């Protein structure tokens, strides 16, 4: 029983593949040998605890480095002219120009400038000194230690929970909606009201004076007497400076809307009310399902009773409760689908409605924070679709799902794949033809001959929000609508002042280039959805190979016969759609960074004239913003962007190195390693050294994964460098 011990079939492999696949089949717990239901769910539960401990031990070190090597107090004194320091650098390979050039933010040595928005976050939430961040780091060290204790505890046989506890979906949803989403957002509200609002108003509220510092002039009297408007009585004025007592109000739960006029960020009183609202509604929504007390819902009978009587949905959702509850890949795919749609809702709502103080002014931090959640969301959504494919191979029972909606997806799967194919082809011919046409017209000396389409649907939606720039004047931009008159005394005085401003990123002025790149975005989502729906629905089998389910999920191919069956598996469709999410989110974040990099220095006409054709994208965005990127180090000297100039070139290595695994395939390298094995076995003084693992080439799935991971690492490092060097070196 060698490594890997979870799979007996890989332990008898005498090659290097045994070393490789044991790393990659390490967390695929259900594919293990001598493996049961209880061990599956308990190992997944303790792996969740280890994941929670890693997240909290990560946050602890991102708090410890700000408290220890970062100037959080100096950034708190002046958040506009001080660069936030992540951590100090101890590199033995620096020369004296590198030590003298990485010393930023008034530090004593070479430090890294934090582009993660942790200073803006911790400032808005109430943390002011380094001692508060250190106490938070020790507290989250304790929390991660408690989660390690709980992870070890639930693997002990006294505290092992059974699968019936794990598959209790009603109790899990009630205690998740009530506890995880309700009492934590009500806990939050208690922080935002007790700590963050008085620290925005200058009052230092800590644990020593928690029971004495009253958050309102009349606290908990008007709450229980019903007059809640006392908590919205005296809001913060427009002369309020953040962190100071002057210009401040006393109301803890306002409904002002819009932005704080000095930080260009959301009001802590609004976010406190926001959390009291997504706390009351989640504790009320957490009393829905039936657990132990007679009242509630059984979701099995909800899904059984939700059948349309015309038969257009077949049996409806009958048999889907056992389908989700028995399949961990269905629950994980649903969780990652929801998580991608909310990690992208995170990205879309922290740039346009900045929630943290002095985050809108720090431009490259905002750029990093958008690109972060759009790449983490384009890998979470692809993981959702890949887990739908793994559900259809190793977890979907056609007998249990008989003529329900999930079986009817397989019944008309060629219609879904062909219509996603039509939509992708439509968007591709139209977007490419219009961009290439606008390229030809700028090439042929005639900018007026472009097909420029004003995006009047989304401009109509912006005028429906309150933008008076386009002059549609339908609702919330005209005073004759009932929605405006229902809102003009309640939230719209903040919202209209925030949306009619042209310096912020709240619902920006869009044009024909925005139309064209939104069809690029629709092309990217549609073609990624095409490959992923095609992988998920041809997961069990297809007309080329009907027994794809009996070959597992991530099998390489089926041989050169029947024309050729390369990339036939559903993992290979996931593999081909990782390139499409990289291209999609590359287009998304190209559009974001160029729409904002022209907004921040003022000349939005550069984007309005140049984004309609791809030579403007190549020249005015990829070439123009890379001026101080690749000049980070020269023969003459090196700048502070030099690490971002190396990380850019580094990306062009790793990405191109992926091509070595994605173009060249196995048997060339297998014969090459055969010649290498002969050469080592015949070389004098080196033949004495043996291998225990037989040297083989990388296997076919492993080759696609290694090329895909290299492609992804190079792709995220070329853009992390360019994006954090073409905004942080030319601020604006």
């Amino acid at each position: 029983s060698r490594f890997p011990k979870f799979s007996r079939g890989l332990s008898q492999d005498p090659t290097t593949r045994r070393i490789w696949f044991g790393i990659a089949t390490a967390h695929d717990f259900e594919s293990h040998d001598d493996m049961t239901e209880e061990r599956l769910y308990q190992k997944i539960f303790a792996s969740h605890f280890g994941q929670l401990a890693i997240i909290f031990l990560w946050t602890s070190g991102n708090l410890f480095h700000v408290a220890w090597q970062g100037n959080f107090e100096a950034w708190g004194q002046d958040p506009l002219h001080v660069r936030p320091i992540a951590h100090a650098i101890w590199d033995p390979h620096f020369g004296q120009p590198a030590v003298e050039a990485f010393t930023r933010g008034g530090a004593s040595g070479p430090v890294n400038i934090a582009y993660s928005g942790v200073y803006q976050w911790w400032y808005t939430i109430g943390l002011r000194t380094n001692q508060d961040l250190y106490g938070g780091s020790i507290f989250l060290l304790f929390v991660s230690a408690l989660f390690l204790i709980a992870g070890w505890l639930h693997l002990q046989p006294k505290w092992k929970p059974s699968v019936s506890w794990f598959k209790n979906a009603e109790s899990r949803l009630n205690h998740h909606l009530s506890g995880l989403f309700g009492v934590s957002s009500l806990a939050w509200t208690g922080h935002l009201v007790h700590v963050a609002i008085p620290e925005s108003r200058g009052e230092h509220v800590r644990w020593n004076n928690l029971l004495t510092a009253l958050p309102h002039p009349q606290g908990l009297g008007p709450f229980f007497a019903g007059q809640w408007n006392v908590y919205a009585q005296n809001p913060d004025s427009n002369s309020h400076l953040f962190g100071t007592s002057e210009g401040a109000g006393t109301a803890i739960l306002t409904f002002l809307g819009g932005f704080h006029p000095q930080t260009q960020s959301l009001w802590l009183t609004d976010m406190a009310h926001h959390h009291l609202a997504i706390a009351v509604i989640f504790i009320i929504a957490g009393h829905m399902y039936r657990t132990n007390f007679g009242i509630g819902h059984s979701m099995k009978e909800i899904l059984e009773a939700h059948t349309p009587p015309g038969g257009r949905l077949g049996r409806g959702h009958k048999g889907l409760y056992d389908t989700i509850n028995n399949s961990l890949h269905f629950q994980l795919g649903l969780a990652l689908a929801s998580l991608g749609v909310i990690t992208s809702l995170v990205a879309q709502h922290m740039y346009s409605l900045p929630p943290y103080a002095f985050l809108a002014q720090d431009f490259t931090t905002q750029a990093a924070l958008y690109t972060h959640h759009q790449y983490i969301a384009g890998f979470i959504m692809t993981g959702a679709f890949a887990h739908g494919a793994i559900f259809f191979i190793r977890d979907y029972n056609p007998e249990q799902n008989k003529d329900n909606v999930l079986a009817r997806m397989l019944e008309h799967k060629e219609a879904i794949i062909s219509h996603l194919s039509w939509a992708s082809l439509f968007l591709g011919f139209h977007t490419l033809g219009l961009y290439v046409h606008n390229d030809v017209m700028l090439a042929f000396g005639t900018p007026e001959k472009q097909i420029l389409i004003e995006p009047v649907f989304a401009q109509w939606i912006q005028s429906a929000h309150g933008k008076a720039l386009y002059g549609f004047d339908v609702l919330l931009s005209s005073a004759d609508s009932p929605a405006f008159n229902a809102g003009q005394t309640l939230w719209l005085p903040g919202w209209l002042d925030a949306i009619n401003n042209n310096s912020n990123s709240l619902f920006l002025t869009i044009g024909p280039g925005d139309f064209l790149v939104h069809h690029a975005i629709a092309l990217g989502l549609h073609t990624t959805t095409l490959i992923l729906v095609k992988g998920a629905l041809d997961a069990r089998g297809s007309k080329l190979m009907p027994d794809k389910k009996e070959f597992g999920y991530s099998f390489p191919c089926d041989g050169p016969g029947r024309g050729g069956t390369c990339d036939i598996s559903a993992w290979d469709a996931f593999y081909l759609a990782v390139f499409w999410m990289l291209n999609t989110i590359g287009w998304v974040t190209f559009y974001w960074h160029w729409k904002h990099i022209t907004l921040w220095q003022g000349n939005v006409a550069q984007f309005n004239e140049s984004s309609t054709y791809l030579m403007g994208w190549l020249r005015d965005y990829l070439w123009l913003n890379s001026s101080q990127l690749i000049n980070g180090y020269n023969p003459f000297g090196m700048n502070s962007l030099s690490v971002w100039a190396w990380m850019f070139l580094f990306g062009h290595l790793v990405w191109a190195t992926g091509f070595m695994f994605l173009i060249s395939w196995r048997g060339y390298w297998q014969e090459l390693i055969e010649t290498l094995a002969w050469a080592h076995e015949r070389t004098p003084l080196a033949n004495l050294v043996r291998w225990k693992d037989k040297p083989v080439a990388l296997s076919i799935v492993q080759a696609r994964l290694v090329g895909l991971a290299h492609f992804s690492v190079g792709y995220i490092f070329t853009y992390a460098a360019f994006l954090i060097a073409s905004t942080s070196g030319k601020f604006g």
Partner: peptide, 30 residues
């Protein structure tokens, strides 16, 4: 700014956390 002795408190509490991470990894093995 934090002090010298507070770094000692953090390093012990991370080493205690590193033991509890080592204890879970032994139990995840078994």
């Amino acid at each position: 700014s934090i002090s010298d002795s507070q770094i000692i408190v953090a390093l012990v509490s991370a080493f205690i956390t590193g033991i509890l991470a080592l204890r879970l990894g032994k139990s995840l093995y078994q």
